[PDB]
Amino acid sequence: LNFNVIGRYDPKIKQLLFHTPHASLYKWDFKKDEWNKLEYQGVLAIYLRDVSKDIYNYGLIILNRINPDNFSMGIVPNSVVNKRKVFNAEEDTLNPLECMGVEVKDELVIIKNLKHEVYGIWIHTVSDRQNIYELIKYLLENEPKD
Amino acid sequence: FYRKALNFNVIGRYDPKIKQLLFHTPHASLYKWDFKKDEWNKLEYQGVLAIYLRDVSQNTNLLPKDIYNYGLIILNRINPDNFSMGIVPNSVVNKRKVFNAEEDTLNPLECMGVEVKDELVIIKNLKHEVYGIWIHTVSDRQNIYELIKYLLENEPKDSFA
């Protein structure tokens, strides 16, 4: 799998949920209105994190195959974000957070984070593309962990 | 998923000389070797990789000497960026070193090279710069290596080959 390897970088990993051998990362530029290629390409994994206040119940990581670079992204379920907005309006007012989102446009799995930054991930295995999309959607639409 | 591609001579819009497409693979990612830090630096190019024959013939009335008989190009799929590299046969570089040393001493050129190292196809520039190309289609790595090797080791070809 890749549990130990990810464990080196994220000590809180509890269970690896999905991984694909080749995924390439891009970032949307709202000014130029285009996709900028980022320095990350390699193994892509999505995993459950032990978060017994860390709001990142899940994590997404891209580990470069030809160099040591790693890209890490936290995945926060909508329920956690909405709960913070309702029962913790103060902290949010200070550090405004919005619900993350995911969509498939063209060949890219597009993800919006808590700060409305948008990333694009290219995955070869077309079957993996749909699986990662459904998995992230599921992780965002349901109540945390298991 | 939705079909969007057209069968079109897109290379020709960036390099008018293309005369014959020799090889293409769907997904290839480009890296460059950094000698100072001894590591691969990821470059902003990934997409369709093609190797093609260029028309550098003098037997034409369209002329009022190009040494790049072949070309390699990577066309980004996610954005409009392209990476281009010319391919010159060793025999042409060697002849040049001897009978045109003046233009050489001004713009030094050495024999290019190619090898396959694990997952990468490694190409050495006419300037000794080293690039690494990760190709998704496994079998295409050996085939591109074989084609470039053949183009480098043989006499300049004007057509088919």
Domain boundary assignment for chain B: 8-154
Contacts A122 to B, Cβ<8 Å: 46, 77-78
b or e along A10-47 (b: 16 or more beta carbons within 10 Å of the residue's beta carbon)?
beebbebbebbebbbbbebeeeeeebebbebbbbbbbb
Q: Using what technique was this structure determined?
A: X-ray
Rounded to a whole number of angstroms, the distance from the CA of A67 to the nearest CA of chain B is 6
Question: A36 to chain B: nearest residue by CA?
Answer: B79
With vertex at residue B9, the alpha carbon angle to CA B85 and CA B137, rounded to the nearest 5 degrees, is 60
Residue A3, number of CB atoms within 10 A of its CB: 13
What is the CB-side half-sphere exposure of residue B25 using CA atoms within 13 A? 21
Place of tokens 């897109």: B10
Stated in angstroms to one decimal place, the resolution of this structure is 2.3
Rounded-to-integer distance, Cα B125 and Cα B107, Å: 13
User: By the 8 A CB rule, do A66 and B40 touch?
Assistant: yes
- Per the listing, tokens 């072949």 go with B70
CATH code of domain B8-154: 2.30.29.30
Q: What count of other Cβ atoms lies within 10 Å of the Cβ of residue B130?
A: 15
* Side-chain half-sphere CA neighbours of B3 within 13 A: 2
Helix (H, G, I), strand (E, B) or coil at A146: coil
* Record: contact B29-A41, CB cut-off 8 A: yes
Helix, coil or strand: residue A95: coil
CB A75 within 8 A of CB A93: no
What does DSSP assign to residue B80? S
A3-142 CATH choice from 3.30.2130.10, 3.30.70.100, 1.10.10.10, 2.30.29.30: 2.30.29.30
Token pair of B80 as six digits: 């409009």
Closest CA to A139 of A56, A53, A19, A31: A56
* Residues A66, B43: Cα–Cα separation, whole Å: 12
How far is Cα A57 from Cα A138, in angstroms, rounded to an integer?
Answer: 13
* Preferred mutation among A34, A66, A69, A70 to probe B, highest tally of B CBs within 10 A: A66
